[PDB]
Amino acid sequence: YDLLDCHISICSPQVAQLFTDNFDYQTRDDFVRGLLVNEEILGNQIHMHVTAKEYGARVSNLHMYSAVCADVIRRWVYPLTPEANFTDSTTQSCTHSRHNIYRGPEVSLGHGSILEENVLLGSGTVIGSNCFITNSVIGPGCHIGDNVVLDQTYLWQGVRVAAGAQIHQSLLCDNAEVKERVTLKPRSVLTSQVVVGPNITLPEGSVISLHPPDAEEDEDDGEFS
Amino acid sequence: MNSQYMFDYPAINILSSVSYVAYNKFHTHDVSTYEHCEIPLEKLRLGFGRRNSLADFYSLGELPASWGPACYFSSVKPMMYTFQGMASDLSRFDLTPNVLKALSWPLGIPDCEIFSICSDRFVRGLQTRDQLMSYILRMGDSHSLDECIVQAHKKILQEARRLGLSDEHYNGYDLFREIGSLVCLRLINA
Amino acid sequence: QVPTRKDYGSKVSLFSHLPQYSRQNSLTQFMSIPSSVIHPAMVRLGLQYSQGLVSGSNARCIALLRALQQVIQDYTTPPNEELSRDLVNKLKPYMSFLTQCRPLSASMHNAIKFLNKEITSVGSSKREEEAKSELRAAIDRYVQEKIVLAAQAISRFAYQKISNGDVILVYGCSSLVSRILQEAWTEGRRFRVVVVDSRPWLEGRHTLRSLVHAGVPASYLLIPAASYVLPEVSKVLLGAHALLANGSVMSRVGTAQLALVARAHNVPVLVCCETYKFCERVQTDAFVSNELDDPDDLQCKRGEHVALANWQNHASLRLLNLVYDVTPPELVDLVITELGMIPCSSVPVVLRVKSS
Amino acid sequence: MEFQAVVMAVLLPVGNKPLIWYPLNLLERVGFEEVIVVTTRDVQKALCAEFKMKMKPDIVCIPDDADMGTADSLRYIYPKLKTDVLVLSCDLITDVALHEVVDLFRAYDASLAMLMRKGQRDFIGVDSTGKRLLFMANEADLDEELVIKGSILQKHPRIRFHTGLVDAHLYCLKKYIVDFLMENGSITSIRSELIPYLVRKQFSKSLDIYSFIKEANTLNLAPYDACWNACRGDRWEDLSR
Amino acid sequence: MDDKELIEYFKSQMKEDPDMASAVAAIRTLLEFLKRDKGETIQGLRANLTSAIETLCGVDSSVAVSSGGELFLRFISLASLEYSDYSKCKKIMIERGELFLRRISLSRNKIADLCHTFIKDGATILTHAYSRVVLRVLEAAVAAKKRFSVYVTESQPDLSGKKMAKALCHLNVPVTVVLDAAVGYIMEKADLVIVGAEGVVENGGIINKIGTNQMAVCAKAQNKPFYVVAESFKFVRLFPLNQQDVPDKFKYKAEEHPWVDYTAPSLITLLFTDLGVLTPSAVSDELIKLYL
């Protein structure tokens, strides 16, 4: 029970043949269970390889996404590192400092702001005054106001945040915007340019988007309808 | 360790009476003095300064080393309590409608020990300490003397708010004077 | 009588005089199951020592005192004999066997000396049950005042030094340090903690499990990287296994390294220890008096090969597993005891005042 | 004194030398000056008289009733119990250094220590270190699926299972186990119900159970084939003794 | 008796005898206040005494005042230890206070009659600021007909060094005033550096004038002897870990200009108190013995 499914498999063309014969099979788990219930006919023993010195995971939801981001920022998947720039792109050039403070080019940290630990800043970002950012990731080209508190959040490219906001454990998709005197509860989600109106505090489970039905709430200038 | 040295230890037995015993050695916690009574600050912390409004101290988790008439340099900025005359006059009464429920407070069962305490013929010597702490021990709901002091002051402040007595006039410099004044005003109110 | 544990593996020439046993070799293989030497309060404690079930010095002292309480309770006087001397003469083999299982520490030495003094102080006219009850009561009072109240007083003292927004460095699994930090965090102090661990015991993880369970922000790293983290460290706090009359500190192997590098980085050093742990004996190095654990713990599996697998087949090769070392007094700035906050040079003074 | 050797018999002095002599000798191989044996009464409550013709160091014999299991025998013999016990069986031919098993009872202060051997129907499951058993069941009470609780896997995420292992019916047991046996008459046999009850009760100041695995010898089982194998191996076993 | 009257009593006691130490005047003020209190309970004594202690500490932020107050309160506890009755207690308080005052009065001469034996003829003396104890021991050394050179720093915040230079020229002693930044340049020509102490911390380090620490470090670099003189009542149960750890109530009120520095015992050769010549461990021993 101590294993973790890395979703990595070594397969033989026999796997393809079994899939093209057994029509009902749809996923890997279905194939494994069907082979393990159809034992005597086409025995086809399945083998396992367990590793304990290297990292491997498969993101499938926001929980796994946050866990994997935290592990990656903390150099758990070395040599893969935000400052390693394994994809040779100019934007993702980074410098590594104490407490895993990753800084890109042209960050322009504001006076009085504090980067505590495990923080990555995209290139072109702007940070206000007396900001407190911890265990978070800020995409390139963002803009943050003064006295903003960010904890375990994730901001993609182009996100704009007004001064005085408090953000914890939420996710803000690209080109999103937040107005003043707004507090986000943990596990909140902002998607695809949704702007949250001033003077509102969203509840714990708060997923919003432009599309009306799927998102729990849809809006562009507020949270009350 | 000069702050930790205490002469008399108020042993606690649990209506909710204390007993002072000869314990002349350095204590494990800071000890404050009020009306010659020693309170071990096991739950609180020693505080300095001559700031008035004793509530200003335990609001920060602190308690003054010494205060009250027993201290010539009391750190609570003493005041007058110009309501004790009727308390002294009624002190000669006994435990005997609306009057009974008026003095049912503080314990909830009517009593008259406070007026004996607040009597004119009350010299606050050594022998007078014990019951006072026991009295305070009956006030609060705790097992530490400092916590009982804090809870009693909370009760005093909230009843003063209830009857509108301008708490800036009630700094808690003398607790028994506050108790007597409030009880007398409640009796005269009805 | 009890046999002698066989030394396992060759030893370094400089450490030829010290014993070195193996965890696989247990002395109980040559002893009766219904223990006939004396009642088996011996064997339980001896096995838990040899197999390393209990590691903390305070834990070792408490376990030894509980076992010896059982010894006293089960003990009965022989006819035509005096308890005050027969008890000690019978107890000496317990100490011999326990030393055979694993060498004793300063705390247990002090406990044995204190209990021997208590037994000697017992008169020859008092009755058996009264003597046993008073011995048990004395053991209980010793445990209380020398561990629990001492720890509480030391925590109260240490609460003063711990300032807001600072970084405190600890080392190894020490109950006193963990309790001090937990109580300090309870009183509203806000700070970080940096944990330094060392092979092969890796017991530092223990205190890490405590720190997260107390909600204290923490960091973890091995000993060699300490020189990398000290510049951002504001205070170093170390538990001690013993204090000597010369002011030196006998502790786990890495303590002296941390003290030296902290001095080289201009960082104050704190040593927290209880008065009962003070030992009158003195030494200037870790060679004269130490303990060599099982060298087989040094083997590690890197990749798919263990380099030290067949180390016995190389005649020239030698392995040492030190468990103790001596920190010189001049690198120590504090000793925090129930008596207060003292310098190292004042260690003998305590030994003078507590002796009478 | 804290171990009181106890011998169960519900046997027959078959073989070159009496069967009951073989385990009892082991007791005198390591101390155990005194030993308690319980005989059968369904056939005749006088086998103790026949056994009294041996030459062991010291023997104590106690008769029983006609129908009484091992747990029932312990229930009868409890008034003679004052400390931890070491229950054995007459049918057991082994050369085990007993000091290993009691070590599990000694070092870890376990509530139960047992001896288990690689046989050459009942499933057992120990942890990775192979000392503390965590699960045990029999196919009699299992229909088709073997059930494991979530909590045990939370505390122990790696369980090693053994199937063909054979018990030696040797157990170091604590006194409060005997007291609990006193408290409840629903228990009739140790192996059948008592041990699995404790194993399950380990997971509701807790219960520690340990088993030592051996690779040398089994007990002379009820089948005559086991008796023949024991007779064949007895010469080699007694060559050292 | 009121706090104001205490303040003028303390100030008058200071002004009448400029040679009196601050702690001596504070102890005299405390004894006089105890003499006229009309209290009845020992606890009432303790509360009033400690409150007056903070009052005087506010009046004068010197470490000596706080040390004297702590010593006074410990003396109160010691006197009350074995006197259940209060009147006998009070009389013993008064008589032991008289003895204590006369002994601390003679303490300076006791230190002088012992310290002067270390002044080698023809040697060089280095001193930091205007300390009365070092002046007294230099007077004693001169009385023994010894010849020596003296260098004194200027103590930039308040030029007490020039005042000491004047007081030494009054005794016909070769003295030279040197800048506070030239100590190293002078450290080569020195033979032994004697300095007074504002206060003594647990392990033997000294609380003193702000420039002391650098001089001690430089002297240790050149391996020159470094002697510190102080009285018994200047002992205190404080223990800084570095210069930052010193309480702010002693640094200031006596950009940023602290009046106080701490010197570690490792840079101190010997201490000269009325008890005798002491190693730094002896101070910790005395403090431990005093508090049980």
- Residues from chain A that touch D125, judged by Cβ atoms under 8 A, are none
**C136/C158 same-domain check:** no
Query: At C131, phi and psi to the nearest 5?
Result: -65, -45
Q: What token pair was written down for A56?
A: 């491997």
**E185/E238 same-domain check:** yes
Measured CA to CA, the distance from residue B8 to residue D143 in angstroms comes to 74
**C199/C332 same-domain check:** yes
Measured CA to CA, the distance from residue E200 to residue C192 in angstroms comes to 32
**E116/E224 same-domain check:** yes
Asked which of C133, C153, C173 is the last residue of a domain, the reply is: C153
* Helices (H), ranges, chain E: 3-16, 22-35, 42-59, 63-81, 86-115, 132-143, 160-169, 183-187, 212-222, 248-251, 280-290
Between the alpha carbon of residue D28 and those of residues D5, D31, D98, E81, E285, the distances in Å are 11, 5, 11, 68, 63
Coil vs helix vs strand at D115: strand
- Residues from chain E that touch B25, judged by Cβ atoms under 8 A, are 292
- Say how far residue B50 (Cα) sits from the centre of its chain: 19
> What CATH number does residue E275 fall under?
3.40.50.10470
**C136/C1 same-domain check:** yes
CA distance, residue E288 to nearest chain C CA (Å): 8
- Residues from chain C that touch B29, judged by Cβ atoms under 8 A, are 156
Of C33, C39, C48, which has the smallest distance from its Cβ to D102's Cβ?
Answer: C33
**C180/C69 same-domain check:** no
**C115/C261 same-domain check:** no
Of C268, C339, C345, which has the smallest distance from its Cβ to E241's Cβ?
Answer: C268
**E7/E131 same-domain check:** no
Measured CA to CA, the distance from residue B113 to residue C221 in angstroms comes to 64
Task: Confirm if D224 and D230 have CB atoms less than 8 A apart.
Answer: no
* Domain of D78, in residue numbers: 4-240
Q: What is the resolution of this structure in A?
A: 3.6
- Going by the DSSP 8-state scheme, the letter that residue D124 receives in this structure is E
Of C330, C333, C353, which has the smallest distance from its Cβ to E241's Cβ?
Answer: C333
Query: At CB < 8 Å, which residues of chain C contact E?
Result: 161, 235, 268, 330, 333-334, 339-343, 345-346, 349-350, 353
Long-range residue pairs from B54-63, CB within 8 A, at least 24 positions apart, any chain = B54/B153, B54/B171, B54/B172, B54/B173, B55/B153, B55/B157, B55/B171, B55/B172, B58/B150, B58/B153, B63/B32, B63/B39, B63/B146, B63/B149
Does D43 contact C at CB distance below 8 Å?
Answer: no
* Domain of C78, in residue numbers: 1-153
**E57/E71 same-domain check:** yes
**E116/E174 same-domain check:** yes
Biggest distance spanned by C-alpha atoms of chain A: 71
**C84/C185 same-domain check:** no
Of E43, E52, E237, which has the smallest distance from its Cβ to B1's Cβ?
Answer: E237
Domain count, chain E: 2
Asked which of E71, E88, E111 is the last residue of a domain, the reply is: E111
CA distance, residue D135 to nearest chain A CA (Å): 15
Task: Supply the DSSP string of B18-55, one letter for each residue.
Answer: EEEEEEEEE-SS-EEEETTEEEE-SSSEEE-S--SSTH
Between the alpha carbon of residue A197 and those of residues A184, A194, C275, E190, the distances in Å are 12, 10, 63, 76
Asked which of C92, C126, C153 is the last residue of a domain, the reply is: C153
> What CATH number does residue D122 fall under?
3.90.550.10
Q: Do chains C and E touch (3 or more CB pairs under 8 A)?
A: yes
Domain count, chain C: 2
C109-140 core/surface letters (b: 16 or more CB in 10 A; e: else): bbbbebbeeebeebeeeeeeeebbeebeebbe
**E148/E27 same-domain check:** no
Q: What pairing do the DSSP bridges indicate for beta strands A95-96 and A101-103?
A: antiparallel
**E150/E211 same-domain check:** yes
Question: Experimentally, how was this structure solved?
Answer: cryo-EM
Task: Please tell me which chains touch A, using 3 or more CB pairs under 8 Å as the contact test.
Answer: D
Closest residue in D to A4 (Cα) is D157
Measured CA to CA, the distance from residue A28 to residue A58 in angstroms comes to 14
- Contact at CB, B73 and E73, closer than 8 angstroms: no
* Helices (H), ranges, chain D: 21-29, 47-51, 70-77, 99-107, 150-155, 175-183, 195-201, 224-240
Asked which of E85, E111, E137 is the last residue of a domain, the reply is: E111
Measured CA to CA, the distance from residue A83 to residue C89 in angstroms comes to 70
**E85/E188 same-domain check:** no
Closest residue in C to D3 (Cα) is C34
**Half-sphere exposure in the Cβ direction for C350 (13 Å, CA):** 26
Measured CA to CA, the distance from residue A25 to residue A18 in angstroms comes to 9
Closest residue in B to C341 (Cα) is B1
**C162/C288 same-domain check:** yes
* Domain of E60, in residue numbers: 3-111
- Residues from chain C that touch D31, judged by Cβ atoms under 8 A, are 32-36
Measured CA to CA, the distance from residue B66 to residue B38 in angstroms comes to 10
**C231/C324 same-domain check:** yes
Does B166 contact E at CB distance below 8 Å?
Answer: no
**E139/E246 same-domain check:** yes
Neighbours of D184 (CB within 10 A): 11
Measured CA to CA, the distance from residue D86 to residue B14 in angstroms comes to 50
- Contact at CB, B65 and E50, closer than 8 angstroms: yes
CA distance, residue B7 to nearest chain C CA (Å): 20
Comparing CA positions, the residue from A88, A74, A177 lying closest to residue A119 is A74
Chain B residues 59-88 within an 8 A CB cutoff of chain E: 65-66, 70-73, 75
Domain count, chain D: 1
Between the alpha carbon of residue B58 and those of residues B43, B46, B64, B179, the distances in Å are 11, 10, 9, 19
CA distance, residue D133 to nearest chain A CA (Å): 17
- Contact at CB, C340 and B28, closer than 8 angstroms: no
**E202/E259 same-domain check:** yes
Asked which of C98, C129, C153 is the last residue of a domain, the reply is: C153
Q: For chain C, what is the HEC assignment?
A: CCCCCCCCCCCCHHHCCCCECCCCCCHHHHCCCCCCCCCCHHHHHHHHHHCCCCCCHHHHHHHHHHHHHHHHHHCCCCCCCCHHHHHHHHHHHHHHHHHHHCCCCHHHHHHHHHHHHHHHHCCCCCCHHHHHHHHHHHHHHHHHHHHHHHHHHHHHHHHHHCCCCCEEEEECCCHHHHHHHHHHHHCCCCCEEEEEECCCCCCHHHHHHHHHHCCCCEEEEECCCHHHHHHHCCEEEEECCEECCCCCEEECCCHHHHHHHHHHCCCCEEEECCHHHECCCCCCCCCCCCCECCHHHHCCCECCECCCCCHHHCCCCCCCCECCEEECHHHCCCEEECCEEECHHHHHHHHHHHCC
Does B130 contact E at CB distance below 8 Å?
Answer: no
Task: Confirm if E227 and E191 have CB atoms less than 8 A apart.
Answer: no
**C137/C173 same-domain check:** no
**E104/E119 same-domain check:** no
**E79/E131 same-domain check:** no
Comparing CA positions, the residue from E42, E47, E49, E40 lying closest to residue E6 is E49
Comparing CA positions, the residue from E241, E187, E180 lying closest to residue E212 is E180
Asked which of E111, E139, E162 is the last residue of a domain, the reply is: E111
Measured CA to CA, the distance from residue E138 to residue E126 in angstroms comes to 11
Q: What token pair was written down for B165?
A: 């007595």
Residue with tokens 């029970």: A1
- Contact at CB, D103 and C48, closer than 8 angstroms: no
* Interface test with chain E among B3, B9, B37, B72, by most E beta carbons within 10 Å: B72
**C213/C310 same-domain check:** yes
**C162/C48 same-domain check:** no
Does B28 contact E at CB distance below 8 Å?
Answer: no
Measured CA to CA, the distance from residue E283 to residue E246 in angstroms comes to 18
Between the alpha carbon of residue E201 and those of residues E26, E63, E170, the distances in Å are 20, 10, 34
> What CATH number does residue E13 fall under?
1.20.120.1070
**C142/C162 same-domain check:** no
- Residues from chain C that touch E242, judged by Cβ atoms under 8 A, are 268
- Residues from chain C that touch E288, judged by Cβ atoms under 8 A, are 339-340, 342, 346, 349-350, 353
Burial class (CB in 10 A: 0-12, 13-18, 19+), E99: exposed
- Contact at CB, B33 and E292, closer than 8 angstroms: no
